[PDB]
Amino acid sequence: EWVGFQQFPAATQEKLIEFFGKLKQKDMNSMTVLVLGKGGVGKSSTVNSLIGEQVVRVSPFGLRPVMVSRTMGGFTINIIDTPGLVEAGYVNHQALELIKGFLVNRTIDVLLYVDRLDVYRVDELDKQVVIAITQTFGKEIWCKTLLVLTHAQFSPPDELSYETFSSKRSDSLLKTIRAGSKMRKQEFEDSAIAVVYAENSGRCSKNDKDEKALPNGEAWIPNLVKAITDVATNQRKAIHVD
Numbered sequence: 001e002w003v004g005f006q007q008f009p010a011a012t013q014e015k016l017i018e019f020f021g022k023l024k025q026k027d028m029n030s031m032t033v034l035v036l037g038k039g040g041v042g043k044s045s046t047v048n049s050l051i052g053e054q055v056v057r058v059s060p061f062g063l064r065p066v067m068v069s070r071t072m073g074g075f076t077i078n079i080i081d082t083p084g085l086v087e088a089g090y091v092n093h094q095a096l097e098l099i100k101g102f103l104v105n106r107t108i109d110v111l112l113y114v115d116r117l118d119v120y121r122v123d124e125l126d127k128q129v130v131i132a133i134t135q136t137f138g139k140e141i142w143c144k145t146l147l148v149l150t151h152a153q154f155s156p157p158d159e160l161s162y163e164t165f166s167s168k169r170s171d172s173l174l175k176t177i178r179a180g181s182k183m184r185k186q187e188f189e190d191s192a193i194a195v196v197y198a199e200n201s202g203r204c205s206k207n208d209k210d211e212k213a214l215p216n217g218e219a220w221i222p223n224l225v226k227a228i229t230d231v232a233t234n235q236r237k238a239i240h241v242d
């Protein structure tokens with residue numbers, strides 16, 4: 001049993017059942033979502049949120065990946081949660097061979113590249129991480145990618161709007177994904193990487209259906225699974241590691 005699914009709001013399960021069924025007609029009855037990111041960004045919390053139960057560890061401070069599989073009515077979602085890819089402000093190459101080792105003989109259907117919304121810049125390290133992922137998995141992982149921005153409930157401090165701040169922050173990271181993967185114009189706009197927002201804090205405003213809602217009113221956990229279901233299905237080739 002997927003026990004976390006009975007603890008979702010009534011309207012979140014209505015939508016999840018509707019998205020899993022839309023896959024079960026392309027004859028896909030399972031999918032593998034890899035979760036990659038720097039430490040601190042909320043990768044483990046987004047897994048706990050998606051699964052609807054506390055299944056991976058949550059911390060302000062390693063070491064092996066953990067696969068989390070749940071089945072609901074003929075459909076299997078496997079989500080791999082990884083160590084942070086960063087340490088001492090340098091790309092951690094060991095955490096990357098551990099993730100690489102756990103993925104040999106697996107088919108990755110979606111990558112969720114996770115970062116925080118609530119951050120004012122991107123640097124060399126952010127690009128060093130994009131490049132290490134490209135060198136590990138191939139430029140093709142970015143055709144199966146979602147940019148997932150946690151802390152979505154943040155309020156920019158400086159008299160500057162939520163949509164101005166977040167479209168700048170998104171633009172930033174997508175431009176860093178492009179440069180770091182050294183993809184050409186045509187290849188980059190034809191992976192057309194979507195940006196989805198996450199609010200994992202228990203402090204998170206609910207909408208009128210008890211769904212964890214973004215500042216615009218939308219149940220972010222349905223938005224995330226619609227988007228996952230879509231990359232899993234966009235008919236770009238999936239990433240088999242061997």
Ligand SMILES: Nc1nc2c(ncn2[C@@H]2O[C@H](COP(=O)(O)OP(=O)(O)O)[C@@H](O)[C@H]2O)c(=O)[nH]1
Nearest residue numbers: 040041042043044045058059150151199200201
């Ligand atoms: N407010 C808020 N805090 C978050 C969110 N996601 C994660 N956190 C917090 O950030 C810290 C790092 O979380 P974790 O999920 O372990 O991220 P990881 O290191 O990438 O696995 C924890 O103390 C979390 O509670 C979010 O969406 N909103």
Ligand SMILES: [Mg+2]
Nearest residue numbers: 043044082084
């Ligand atoms: Mg973690």
